[PDB]
Design a protein around this ligand. Structure first.
Ligand SMILES: C[C@@H]1O[C@@H](CC(=O)O)[C@@H](O)[C@H](O)[C@@H]1O
Ligand SMILES: [Ca+2]
Ligand SMILES: [Ca+2]
Length: 114
């Protein structure tokens, strides 16, 4: 199934934050309505934040996270979670190799803000 694609209420601000846990250098792209809106890169074996930014959902609400390592697309897993019917997390893990820890780049989207 498709992973890394989330529908947010339209014209709503949201945060996105990426962490790295791999020997390979991670690159994360964020597409809002199929247009590249943020990109992070870095390397960490220690969960370092390689990027963070507030974005807007736009008219579509379609947010999609992508991850690649030196050009090779990582395999994604994702889910959305809602707490107390109000607080939203969209979560993404990714695997760039063979050990299937799926934490190579870890991305977290959250909303509402403010
Ligand atoms: C340090 C390692 O780097 C990668 C592979 C190479 O080596 C990751 O896929 C592993 O999970 C682990 O973080
Ligand atoms: Ca891995
Ligand atoms: Ca890892």
């Amino acid at each position: 199934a498709t992973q890394g694609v989330f529908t947010l209420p339209a014209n709503t601000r949201f945060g996105v934050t990426a962490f790295a846990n791999s020997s390979g250098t991670q690159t994360v792209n964020v597409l809002v309505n199929n247009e590249t809106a943020a990109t992070f890169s870095g390397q960490s074996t220690n969960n370092a934040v390689i990027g963070t930014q507030v974005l807007n959902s736009g008219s579509s609400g379609k947010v999609q996270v992508q991850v690649s390592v030196n050009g090779r697309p990582s395999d994604l897993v994702s889910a959305q979670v809602i707490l107390t019917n109000e607080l939203n997390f969209a979560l993404v893990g990714s695997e760039d190799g063979t050990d299937n820890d799926y934490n190579d780049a870890v991305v977290v989207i959250n909303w509402p803000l403010g």
